[model samples]
Target chain A: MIFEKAVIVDLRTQVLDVPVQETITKDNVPVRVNAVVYFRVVDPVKAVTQVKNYIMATSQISQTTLRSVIGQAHLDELLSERDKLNMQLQRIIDEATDPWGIKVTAVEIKDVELPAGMQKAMARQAEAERERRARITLAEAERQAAEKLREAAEIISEHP
Target chain B: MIFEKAVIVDLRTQVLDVPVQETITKDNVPVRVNAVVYFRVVDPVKAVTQVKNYIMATSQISQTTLRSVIGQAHLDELLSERDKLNMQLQRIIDEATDPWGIKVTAVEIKDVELPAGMQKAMARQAEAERERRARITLAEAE
Candidate 1:
């Protein structure tokens, strides 16, 4: 009865890895993604009693939250906006887990990988940008070359 | 005697917001900068016992370290090199706190606000780079 009166728990900060799930980004790009969440059990009693299983409960919500948030971000945003999304996940998951007395400190997106087809597509698009930048330089070099030709004198017959 | 036997400390991972301090970079661009340090006291025994007040000690060193390290860099370098500065902060702060047994998890420079007088220089330099890149378009031949 005494042991039941005071349930023990590890108060050390914990990390959970949400398994990778297939999700479509807001830009309609299908990709495989996974995330890591750092959380702590601030209140031991509330953690055990408020939720049936604290770890799995936090984990379940983390997975759904990660997917739902991922659904709203563009693929490019996912690449450049990791900090924004990181806080978004933490705040969203933190609010959800508050009822169970847990704190979600940080959330990091571990990986976001595209299909081979998309990689090829991305490469082609990159080439368009790359060549467009490169070709402009050559255009200028030739322009200067022609400018000298324009400055050359035109010989005229003196006694016509 | 009983109280001495059972020492108490807050074990939660804590975040400290450092006040803004104006520091000139290695190139000596005077600017106001602030930072935040994230750390946790894993060993309460060493924290309270080793240091008089762990929190204040950690913060004082964090700010000075910020100033000293940033002083060795140029304003342009500071603007471009945030991540490296962050790592440097964490490493330096963690070493100082090692005696207290505190773990510095992360350090982030929140902002670097340039003085109004310097903004024009930044604006002009930025324009010059863009102009260099853009003026080439007029020289292209069909």
Candidate 2:
């Protein structure tokens, strides 16, 4: 089997592009955010089929997509259901990339760069989720123990 | 909303109804194989609609299905890819159970209850799986 030549672009090369506007609100405060995104292609055929400059195209699309998706969602959705968001982002990127022979294998949330107050708010939300799980587990154990006790009582009553 | 009454039979009741067949492989072979299978249903609708007596039916199906599925495979398949076999069993049981409304959430081979020789074989199989996983993770880490 023979392999063909592939053009590789230096990922460090940055191009100034139009920015997508995003406003993050946490604990009754809004923080205006701006970001420069970067990406590289894993699949060559998918990249060529999908975008003009495959590597650069996703970086451009991702900025706006990330803003829109993250903007509509609360901080909890971003932090807790990270896997779900990653899957959704991969699907979006993969669809855009089908023509470029690029398969979006992985996508990383490089930095959230959250407003100082937003970080504190997220910490509280995380604490609440953990507490809720602990309480549910405790309740389940109690319920199971009570049922077992009642069953044992019935058996003793029959014999006595 | 009206909820229908359903009977929940424990393992003891089911074991009485369904007599498990067993035999010694050889005269000197002291290893008697005992298969302890665990199963549970999460969906009541799937249990009732798909099969008759969801628990009993699925439990028996799980045992025989486990044996047949296990018999066809090697040590690696049984120890490492047991979940794959469990999914296959779930699919089969679920299809038979669709009419009864019972869904097979999980089917697990709790213990092989192998004879001494078979026990040693299973022990080796488990050790091999662990080693393979350790090597894969180490390579990935590197």
Candidate 3:
């Protein structure tokens, strides 16, 4: 039985700069944000026939989708629940690009240019969380110590 | 403006265990699964006075909480969304120990000791995820 071996079909790679829009503040002033995204092709056929410039199409979709998703979420969710957001973004990109024959393997938030006031606000939020935890723990320690002391006193009186 | 010097407090570290109860079948034989956990304290007064041997107490709470959480979730969540589980475990432990004064800095699945049959099942589940992604990518290429 003479059969042709599964030879390497086609391997192609492309990197595209996906333009994205954002809002950042400078010198206490708010300004529009603009940036570029980077992505590549793992599969060529899907890259060629799925849509116009698979890399650019997917990048554009990811940039817009991520912006909308991030905009809806607060800084707390964005910072503390980053893993959740990444998983969501991955699923969105993978599903959107599936038909185009492109496999969205990895996506990253290379940089987030935030307004100065927003950045300071996020810092304060983090500091407050720490302070709150500290106060709660301190009160809890006092209660536990008092309870333990009472237990010791009862033990001494009963044994005597 | 002048500022006061900040006082640094050292907290004692503790290790808590998350218990696992798994029944494994191999060639018609049954086996059980278990594990040990390790952790550290970022705040000391909270570690010593807040809970009973902060390490052991937190470890026990984290262990039990994670076991229950993982047992209920599917392998897909366990593998791909591990960070979520870690965060949830931390949150659960933190809430439970709040009164005890202990803070859970990190909760990790050190290792999962799966029975032979379960290991194979999990392996298949993992392979399926990768295979599905690869296949979809290949199809898109065509």
Candidate 4:
């Protein structure tokens, strides 16, 4: 019997959750980060031949890329401008997975686990900010009150 | 000598940093929050006469309003959705201070201070989440 050869590949988006640990940021803070990457196979022939398992290979690439990208960013940048970082992650992962015929659709940082010590320090920093605002509010109130009283004194002297 | 007077007001922006304290979230965590309010006096006569001191009055209103508004919000909302809360604050403060000719331009929550225990708990929570993801990743690899 003669049969035609065919291979079926799923082009649906694949999701990968990668947890990275001990990635040092620009501030030298050690953090653990959880990220998700979405990818799909574009070229089935290259994906089947160039890589052993495209899904597994893509996941590995995503994990390493996440660590490297996060390691270069400051903790502040990681927390505040995460969207930019996510796009950067997607771009780099897509480029690396190109040879395997995998297209990275999106990448997202789910969470960042800061050290306990660093958390405490941030808490202290926030407290200091509150204290500073309180002092400034009090000083501003006093200055305004004193200015009004001084202006009243000037008016009284002008009339007397 | 008595002379006719014309009132001229400077509409330049002014900033006030107000500190507020409240219990937030289901845990009723007591937190100190710092916020900055930007405002300006639009009418000199109303600002000087309608209010004893427009700046002080506006600042006091901002502090109280911040506490009340933030008190109704959850801790996570305070941390993540601060911009929404800020607009709500500016709107309320601006409406209340309108009679005194003070226009609230913007408000921003600068910092949130949670208890040390809460901070440590959040860190542990994050760690658990990370571990769970790692296990699932390994399972997926298999």
Candidate 5:
């Protein structure tokens, strides 16, 4: 039997979750985000020796990758181009974890929560836009009504 | 030098940081807190045999005890009575890890990181308070 050379490892493919992170997008939108990373240990020797805790290391990597990738995207693209972003996430994490003998199969962005503060901020923004449009509407109405009044007065004066 | 039965143990009186934890106080206020723990191995045999990992065990114990003690006191008392809480933290952690032959010296709450989200949470809390006091202020103005 071996002594100090042997170490225990779970070679089975495992599922791990990256917790919600408060991150900012390229367009400066604050979002709470989370994901699931699929991976398994391919080489126990490198898995144990190259990193202290491979699973935890993978989790930490997923979090930063999520932040960086999400930061590069605008809010509209983040929602629309999700498949591309997922591939990018999986690629970056897998590359980083490869030396540790970890094969990351998939990274799925689980949720994106724009906080209550986000909504409140949005409301304030639209509030200004609302007032500006109202003034424009009233000004247009005033111009049309005055033009109508002038036309009627001109007709009465010329005819009389 | 040799072999299978021998285990590694750190006999040194080591200092370890308990990472920041998001814990709720007795008044239901969510607070982020971190701490430091002081410990040493008195019996290496018991340290290895009785527990799988003493350092991790002590750390986990410290977190739970910190939460328990912190939750037992109001947010105001948490700071005012920090010294008492530290001693209580030390005591409880000592009791739990004593079986693992660990001698805990002190537990100090190190830093508090009340997240921006915590501020958002508190803003709503005092939003009502702000409106209530706004009327009070208005009444005074009138």
Candidate 6:
């Protein structure tokens, strides 16, 4: 038992952080994003022989995919539709690394930090939406009040 | 019929971002954590009558719960057992706000930002783990 050479790879999820570059989004906003990729080597033989370093190769692929996929999305989509983006990332990386026997199980965007100016802009946009709703509510109430007054006046005129 | 005033509260899920606060973990390390709470008004009457502002009240409860729950846990539990903490938070907040008719649907720890020093420490720990694994692999090869 002690003389045998070990070749079987223990399949376990490896976590790595990939920092994406300041890619220009669809709306022309530059943003930095960070993601965590969890992957495992499925085939021990291919993983050891096909790649010089499977972990390094996986991390490199993850970084590029994170940037390229995020670049195609609008800022709003990137913020709100993160789950879809994660799935897209997993699929792409898994397909690319299949030859190396690495399977990407999950990828999650850890943080999406927008520039200070962009954050302020989003805040202002939200304020505008609240103001619009308030105005609409006021107008609807006024119309209802006016109709009630007209009905009251008709009832008094009929009684007289 | 038109003189009566009616208020219809939104039962839809509302997302609240609690402010970041520093709390000490079981290991005595200070960490800053932020959380998101999702809640809805189940009974509008109780929500309006029992509490002056249900949203504000819920936010306060969430903030305190986030601090207390995380404070009692170690840094590792805070990071890995987040689901358990979140569920614990939801249950606590839901019970506390029951009188006000606010149902806490979900509570999520959004971010746990460690200090720079702690980050370095964690990096070293990870490196040590990798080195240990490599050694084990080498021993197996022999």
How close is every model to the real structure, measured as TM-score?
0.45, 0.31, 0.38, 0.44, 0.37, 0.50
Error of 3 at B87 (Å): 43
DockQ, all candidates in order = 0.01, 0.01, 0.01, 0.01, 0.01, 0.02
Q: State the lDDT of candidate 1 residue by residue for B1-142, as single tens digits.
A: 4554343454766789987777677886677787889988778889878888888888899889988888987776565667787798898888888899788998887756666535444544655676786778767742
The sequence of per-residue lDDT tens digits that candidate 3 reaches over residues A28-96 is 333333323333344433444447555567767877877666666665555467668667776787778
Task: In model 5, state the lDDT of residue A72.
Answer: 89
lDDT of 4 by residue, A1-160 (tens): 1121111233246578875646899879888897888876666456656666777888788889988988899999888999999999999999999998777899999989888887888889999999999999999999999999999999999898
* Per-residue lDDT of candidate 5, residues B1-142 (tens digit): 8775443455666797886667778888667776889887778889888988777788887878887887787765554466777898888888898899878888887654443444334434645675788999999998
Residue A68 displacement (Å), model 2: 1.8
Per prediction, the TM-score for chain B is: 0.84, 0.49, 0.55, 0.83, 0.71, 0.87
Steric clashes per prediction: 1, 31, 19, 0, 0, 0
Interface RMSD for candidates 1 onward, in order: 26.8, 25.1, 17.6, 28.6, 21.9, 19.5
Question: After superposing candidate 5, which stretches have Cα over 4 Å from the reference?
Answer: A1-12, A117-160, B1-142
Q: Which of 5 and 6 is the better model by DockQ? A: 6
True contacts kept of 2: 0.00
lDDT of each: 0.78, 0.51, 0.55, 0.77, 0.76, 0.78
TM-score of 5: 0.37
lDDT value, candidate 1, whole model: 0.78
Docking class of 1: incorrect
